[PDB]
Structure formats: C-alpha cells, structure tokens
Design an enzyme around this catalytic site. Structure first.
Site, mmCIF file in Angstrom:
data_model
loop_
_atom_site.group_PDB
_atom_site.id
_atom_site.type_symbol
_atom_site.label_atom_id
_atom_site.label_comp_id
_atom_site.label_asym_id
_atom_site.label_seq_id
_atom_site.Cartn_x
_atom_site.Cartn_y
_atom_site.Cartn_z
ATOM 1 N N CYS A 31 3.239 1.596 9.417
ATOM 2 C CA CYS A 31 3.103 0.490 8.484
ATOM 3 C C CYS A 31 4.503 0.056 8.065
ATOM 4 C CB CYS A 31 2.213 0.831 7.291
ATOM 5 S SG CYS A 31 0.495 1.094 7.777
ATOM 6 N N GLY A 65 2.115 6.040 9.740
ATOM 7 C CA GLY A 65 3.508 5.921 9.345
ATOM 8 C C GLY A 65 4.226 4.719 9.955
ATOM 9 N N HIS A 82 0.822 -1.200 0.000
ATOM 10 C CA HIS A 82 0.000 0.000 0.000
ATOM 11 C C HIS A 82 0.868 1.268 0.000
ATOM 12 C CE1 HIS A 82 -0.432 -0.202 4.647
ATOM 13 N NE2 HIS A 82 -0.062 1.102 4.454
#
EC number: 3.4.19.12
Lengths: 306, 306
Positions: free
Chosen positions: B145, B143, B41
């Site tokens: 991830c 942030g 993503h």
C-alpha cells in the site's frame, strides 16, 4: 497477490549510462568509476561492419577520437583499450553515481532486467531471460547498442549483459561486461545461426508454483513420474532436461506449497501431452519460462533493494 | 525490433519513496517537496479496517504519532491532513530529489508503470493498464500500500495511481494522488463489486499494428467493415466500443503500416469470431490490450527520457 513480469528498479543503472561517439557512430556506454564500457563496433562505419578487422580499425583511433557525453557534460578520454568485443575508455573523472557493482557471466535460463537506452538516455526497463541458445528476445532499435542487462542484490548491481547485435532473424545477441559473447555470435554484419531454442523447464515449473500460490491449481493431479520418465517426454517437446540440481532449486517452492517437485513435473507432463484446453494460467495461454525459481520467491516474498 | 511490455525507468520515483508508520501499521509514502503522501488507512489496525471511521481515528493522532523514514533519515512531521483517502504529512524538509512532477487522473485503458515497494524500499517495476472497470491486475503483497503508478515525459513524472487495496477477488484498487478512488471502491475491508471488465479495443488494435510492424502478419484478412458493424461484434465479445477519437489516435500507425484502421478492425473481428487456432501474435496466444497507441509508437520509435 497477483503475479507480473517485474524488472528491478533501474535508478542505479540510469546514473551510469553515457553516450559514446566515434566518427558518425553513436551508441550507449556504461560509466563506472573512471572507465566507460561500450561495444567495440562503435569504431565501425556501417560498411566496416560487413567484415571488420577491429585491431586495424582501432589503431586508426586515438583517445581524442572518442566523444563520451554524460547528460550535459562531456568526459575526457585519456586511455582506450579493447577487451574482447568491448572497448574500455579510461576517462579523467570517476562516475560519482557509481553504484556498488560486479560483472557476472550468467547461465542460460537465468533472468535479468534490461535498461533500454538511446543516445545514452534511458527509454524503458523490462525483464528478459537468456535463452538456452544464448539469444535474448528483447526490444532494441538502432542506437540501443551498449544497453545493459543486470540484476540487483540489495545494494549491489550485477551487470551481466551488454547489447551488441540484432541477428537478421530479429533476436538479440550481446556480451558479458568483459566483452565475451554469449553464444556463438560475432560482432560482424553477416548471416549468423542461433541454435535450436528450447523451453527452460525449471522456469516453467517455478511459474506453475507461482500459479498455485496465487490460486491457479487446476493443472494439479496426483500422478507421479521419475526425473528420467519426465525428461523422455520433455525432450519430445523441446524442453530442457530437468536435473537434480533443478529439483533441489525448486525445493523451497515445493515446501511452501506442499507439492513435491516430481508431482509438479507429473502435472507439467500432462500439460504438454494433453495441452491446456482453453484455460489460462496466471492470465497466460502459454506456459511461461522467463521466471526463475528465485524470481518467483522474490516476487512472492516481496524482497526489496536498498 | 522485438516488442516487450516495457516500464518507464523508475529512478526519479525511487528517490521519492519513504516509509510511513503509525502505531503498528507500516506502508509506503511518496515524498515530494515538503509533503509525504500516503494511504489514510495507515492509521488503521487490521480491526479498524473492517469498518473505519477515519475522521474519528485521525482525531486521536498527533504529528509525532507519524514516523516517516527516508533511507536512514527520520523526517520530522509538522502537520497532517486528510484529503479524501490520502493522508498528507507536512515534514520539515523538502525532498532534495523531488523531480518535476504532475498529479494526473488517468482514464480507463491508459497504461502506467508501477514501482512496487515494501517498507519504503523499491522491489520491482512493471507496466499496468487501468482496466475499464477501474481495477488493476497488479502484483501487490501485504505492505505494498502506498506504491505509486506513474508516466514519464522527458523529465516530468506524472503520478496517476496510489495503491490502497486488494479486493477479495484478488484484483487491486487505489486512488489518484488527490485521494480519489478509481472506481466505486472504498478503503474498507468489505465485499466490493467491480464492474464487468471489458477488453480495451483501441489497445488491441494498437498491438496488432505493432505486430505488423514486427513482421507478424498472418492475421491480416481481405475484409473491411464499418465502425458500427465492428462495434456490434465488439459488444458481444466484451470489447469496448471503438469511437472516431480512437480511430484518430490509431492514425499514425495506419499511416506507417498502410493498413486502414477499418481494415485492421475487420481482421480483429475475424480473430474474435474464429479465435486464433492455436497461433500466436508477438509471442502471445491471446489478444493483448495493455499497450496504448502511444506506447506502441513510443516503443517503436525509441523515445527517451532524461
């Protein structure tokens, strides 16, 4: 979102841990530049521990009686001295993994990470508060002595704790890195009393703001108190009194949440007086006091290291 | 003595964390040998995330559209591919700090350590369990991830988790390092149901053993029970079924403490039916289910890594 008891990353500390051996006693040392720091009770047999004269014990020891091992290799000691309750072994090699560092003496209520080690090897990292009575509630086995506590400031490791002792009551005592005990304790195997402990009020308040930030708000109410009002309740629950300094440190959290410090105090007053019923807060059935106001802002703002 | 929720030392994982940027999205990647692993993503805008067609989004990307930064070093991307929900970026340089590692898929109820990171930089380390419903109750801001979960075995890192998302419920979901989600989850900003989340019985029992080991004994009763009797009670309390495999794993704790597993089960049954009456166990007013039996043995035995 979410809130957890986070430790600092430990990589910079892991590279400073060594094994120190003297006679048949082994514990952990901290190798920074050309100096290894460890608990002076490395020089004691189990029998010596009952009533050590460290000056006399250390005289019977020469440089060469100290076996310092860095993972594989083995360092050469060319100097030793005793600073309060720590031994400083000058070695012939600077630690090439020496981080930027300072030595700091923390205050009761402040938090740090402990890198628990055995025989100079890292086992585990966890976040601890220094209790108001200068003990820590840690997790330390035989061999864990000389394990250190620390904070990190982007790239600089602030060392604040070296583990020295388990009290007969199973809680932990230790020194700053200049070898001065926190609290009234001595490095002798003898019955020793820790004070009455108290709850770190400013930390519980921090943690309630963390709860609101994360969507836990049931304990809120539009009641008021003065600081003096609140403290006359807090002291009946063995809470540390809250000072204006403490109110000022909570200012930013107040600002972020739109809940005045004295309102959060009213909310805590209620929680102590009335209990929690069955409900939890941030997944806890008790009030947590091991997050400082600065811990909550860091975790809730995602501050990083290096 | 003492008992704490302890993470692995993070140093070996710290050396693998990098920043990956694609357009205006930045997140964390894991750099091992000459591959960087990150959530796919990273190619998505906030808009895209509502209904992404990852195949079509990735078509529009070339190697040079991927900025990978390790410290101050910009790595050159020479290849990209999508494997399930992770993107793999081939880079021209092997990570000189790659540890020995495995990729493992953990089972529900297993624990691991998370190194929470922002912009490729470590923020904090904490110990987590994979919930029976394949979520984790973490601490992850915008942030985070690409942060990873891991276990360590002397010198070998077992990576088991990469963070991908927060569900509208506030719990966390991600993948193994092959990009397969734990649980029914997809990488889309949409309503997503987690299962009902049950207590990890075997871990609770482990933790009761730990309590006994640390001298916390008040909850030991004078009843026994059968596995079936126990399980009948367990299901009603949303506790996972206990199996012979679980009984077998508790065996060493049974042996150390002299308390038969099914005796500990009858104690637990009594806490479930009667509750704790405002008492605490190992400092907790709730039954803790994030320690595995291995965690308890490891911590109670002082197992170290490099």
């Amino acid at each position: 979102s979410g809130f957890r008891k986070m430790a600092f990353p430990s990589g910079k500390v892991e590279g400073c841990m060594v094994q120190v051996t003297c006679g048949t006693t082994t514990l952990n040392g901290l190798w920074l530049d050309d100096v290894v720091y460890c608990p002076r009770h490395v020089i004691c047999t189990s029998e010596d521990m009952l009533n050590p004269n460290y000056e006399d014990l250390l005289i019977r020891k020469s440089n060469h009686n100290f076996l310092v091992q860095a993972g594989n290799v083995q360092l050469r000691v060319i100097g030793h001295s005793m600073q309060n309750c720590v031994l400083k072994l000058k070695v012939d090699t600077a630690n090439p993994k020496t981080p930027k560092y300072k030595f700091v003496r923390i205050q009761p209520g402040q938090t740090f990470s402990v890198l628990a080690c055995y025989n100079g090897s890292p086992s585990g990292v966890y976040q601890c508060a220094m209790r108001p009575n200068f003990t820590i509630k840690g997790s330390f086995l035989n061999g864990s002595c000389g394990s250190v506590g620390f904070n990190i400031d982007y790239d600089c490791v602030s060392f604040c704790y070296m583990h020295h002792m388990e009290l007969p009551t199973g809680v932990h005592a230790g020194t700053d890195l200049e070898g001065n005990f926190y609290g009234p304790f001595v490095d002798r195997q003898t019955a020793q009393a820790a004070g009455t402990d108290t709850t770190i009020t400013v930390n519980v308040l921090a943690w309630l703001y963390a709860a609101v930030i994360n969507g836990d708000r049931w304990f809120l109410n539009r009641f008021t108190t003065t600081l003096n009002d609140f403290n006359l309740v807090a002291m009946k629950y063995n809470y540390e009194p809250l000072t204006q300094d403490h109110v000022d440190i909570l200012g930013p959290l107040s600002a972020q949440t739109g809940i005045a410090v004295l309102d959060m105090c009213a909310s805590l007053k209620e929680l102590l007086q009335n209990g929690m019923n069955g409900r939890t807060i941030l997944g806890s059935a008790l009030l947590e006091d091991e997050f400082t106001p600065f811990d909550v802002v860091r975790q809730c703002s995602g501050v990083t290291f290096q």
